[PDB]
Amino acid sequence: DIVIDNQGSGCMVDRPFREAIDTFHNGLRQRIAKGEAEGYGPAREMYGLVYDCGLEEEARKEIKLPGYADLHHRGVTRFSGDYEGSAISALKEILETFSADKNSMRQVVYPKATRFGCSGRLRRRMDWVCVYDKKPKDGESFEGGKPCNENKDCTYYKGSTCEWNLCYTFFAA
């Protein structure tokens, strides 16, 4: 599993922050696809999220102007917390707390989202938003299909490569 990056730029958040968030997202997704994430249900077709600098820039706009992303019909997650040590360790902890928020995790884990980007700001407290190309709806079922082994296993979107049992497309729009 490695980060798959598209666009620019947009990507102004530093690499390890971007990577920590991307790994948290796609790591979970990969485990869910293989039906082996405690509490997330049976194996399924899953798309990896492409990290998208354009959407990171939308996340930055969303921080400055709450409501921005919804206007562009995006999914949004937010996570924050006070901290004292290094930003990178705090983030890691904030993500653990974040992973216990069932409503946020619905977006994180939605098999038909295909790209996202995040941005944060420091004030010592940090605030992050993530913006996703696809927002699930309430009651929408997430189960279905199978974890990909080859390209032809990815059915949700046209031009998809299966990589680490995740489907990747760059043209879901």
b (16+ CB within 10 A) / e for 101-130: eeebbbbbbbbbbbbbbbbbeeeeebebbb
Judge contact between 170 and 157, C-beta under 8 A.
Answer: no
Distance separating alpha carbons of residues 159 and 155, to the nearest angstrom: 9
- For tokens 């796609």, name the residue: 26
Query: To 5 degrees, how large is the angle CA 162–CA 10–CA 106?
Result: 50
Distance separating alpha carbons of residues 144 and 103, to the nearest angstrom: 20
Distance separating alpha carbons of residues 63 and 130, to the nearest angstrom: 10
b (16+ CB within 10 A) / e for 37-68: eeebeebbbbbbbbbbbbbbbbbbbbbeeeeb
Peptide bond into 41 cis (omega under 30): no
Distance separating alpha carbons of residues 75 and 107, to the nearest angstrom: 7
The first and second tokens of residue 56, run together, are: 């990171």
Does residue 32 sit in helix, strand or coil? helix
PDB experimental method: X-ray
Domains in the chain, CATH or no CATH each: 1-173 (3.40.33.10)
- Phi-psi region for residue 141, left (φ > 0), alpha (ψ -120 to 50) or beta? beta
Spacing of C-alpha 151 from chain mean position: 21
DSSP 36-93: -STTS-S----BPPEEEHHHHHHHHHHHHSTTHHHHTT-EEEEEEEE-SS-HHHHHHH
Residue type, 26: N
